[PDB]
Amino acid sequence: IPVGARAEVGTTGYGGALLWQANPYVGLALGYNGGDISWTDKYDLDMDNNNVYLNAEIRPWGASTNPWAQGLYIAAGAAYLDNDYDLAKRIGNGDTLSIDGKNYQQAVPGQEGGVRGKMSYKNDIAPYLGFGFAPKISKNWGVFGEVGAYYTGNPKVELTQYNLAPVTGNPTSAQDAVDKEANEIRNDNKYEWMPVGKVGVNFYW
Secondary structure, rough: OOOOOEEEEEOEEEEEEEEEEEEEEEEEEEEEEEEEEEEEEEEEEEEEEEEEEEEEEEOOOOHHHHHHHHHEEEEEEEEEEEEEEEEEEOOOOOOOEEEOOEEEEEOOOOEEEEEEEEEEEEEEEEEEEEEEOEEEEEEEEEEEEEEEEEOOOOOOEHHHHHHHHEEOOOOOOHHHHHHHHHHHHHHHHHHEEEEEEEEEEEEEE
């Protein structure tokens, strides 16, 4: 029987979790994170998230009566993961945009130009490692922040561009810039981990 529950928002979506406490040092969080968010600004940013996680939570000082200490935890578990991240930059007449640190402008002044990229993480099980801070404000309420990563392997990447030419003094074409940036994300092994952050509120019945 669970000891409470939390609401949370972050980079893998929003939702919440049920929470058990076997003892002051060891607890469990079974949660759902989802959503389909868009921020349209020039820039369009999308997230489609649908995931379920189960983590053990180790509070090394879980019995402390100093809340800063008892607040601290390590999180280890696994999750079913499905997350898409989209970014689209579009430029109109006279505008500029950048790829992989380099700048581009319209290739022909008629039509808009742009870049559209997608990254997808789909894993039936991906192990998780995280570090959180979750101090109790009282018995009933707390707030928390958590940071960590899933071991997913490199994600799928689409990276395309429309109607783009380098600005003068940039030797690299739009195509090479997107090919290089995509490949880094597919092959480079720092990208075998999906980093994550979230924050939220804990309630304890």
